[PDB]
């Protein structure tokens, strides 16, 4: 991860820059409800402009068109408008992202042109698959995927990828742009710096906080983290599988991963061999059903959860034990809330934990927040600036934590 060319080292003078960005912003009726994702890209674009780029060609996706043109539903046009404001400068919107018209527009544009192409996932060749009118799955054609990729490549002299949250997929805009320099943008650079350090040479003690719902789909996540951490909190729905298996806890109607249950002792076994201290919750906020407005109660590992009730958050004693581990940590990676954060009644455990993680940052702890749900919590409670790094990609950060090679990152130029 440390070895990749980045925009700041990329000579852009006189050069057409084709830049993959993440402009998948929240929307209601083709009006942008939060422009944060667009503003995050501005530094990369403005850098190209300020250093004499002939053009910047922006490409991205939005919504779920699924390989079909939906310009009434998932057009990037509104985003071109918003971008005009943010840059203080015209953005040319083109109605497609490939083909002879688009290539002609991009071939030798007026010096300093900013161009936004239309949604990449209007074409089946981006993701390599999609759906038709009736919702039947359809596959893309190999020769067409090739031509789509060659068309994207014509649009610039150099390539910048600043869409970390898509770099876990081998999509055409991630891996298909064949130019002699392919560099990470300023957002990508951040992602690579933080996760490279945490995976290759973290501060010690290194704590991982892993939350979620099921166990069986995080074996490799847990396995790879146990190769590298000094401590690991387990929370969220996951924990009840560990507790039933390890302590014969009665869990009522709480999530139970029947498959995951059978490898729990194997995971602890590995932790023991490596000297990883595992901190599991010891008490819970319970709900009579999986509903935002369910009746609430309280339970401990000792009491167990009564029949017909489920544990949707940790309780105050668990919060302390989590806090003891956070206090010891010099580096933290947090991927996954420890309760049903979406519903206020079961968000306290995650909010409290978030406060401890903020306080740790103040004292010099390195704190990395995974994308997806953990980063939503940071947005929702105004702590994006109070941790060291909030990741911009859920699936992407998770695959890095699993120890995988990300196609989009791997395709970047070295040194
Ligand atoms: N105790 C719990 N019971 C049920 N769901 C939980 C609990 N704690 C957290 N969650 C939920 O887990 C979800 C995140 O699950 P996810 O990260 O997708 O795990 P998985 O990939 O195993 O489904 C969140 O929507 C959150 O509301």
Numbering used by the authors: 2 to 416
Task: Provide passages from the article that reported this PDB entry.
Phosphoglycerate kinase 1 (PGK1) is an ubiquitous enzyme expressed in all somatic cells that plays a central role in glycolysis where it provides energy in form of ATP through the reversible phosphotransfer reaction from 1,3-bisphosphoglycerate (1,3-BPG) to MgADP in order to produce 3-phosphoglycerate (3-PG) and MgATP in the presence of free magnesium. PGK1 is a monomeric enzyme of 417 amino acids formed by two distinct α-helical domains of equal size, the N- and C-terminal domains connected by a hinge region. The N-terminal domain binds 3-PG or 1,3-BPG while the C-terminal domain binds MgADP or MgATP. Two different crystallographic conformations of PGK1 have been already identified: the partially closed conformation, able to bind substrates, and the closed conformation, the catalytically competent state.
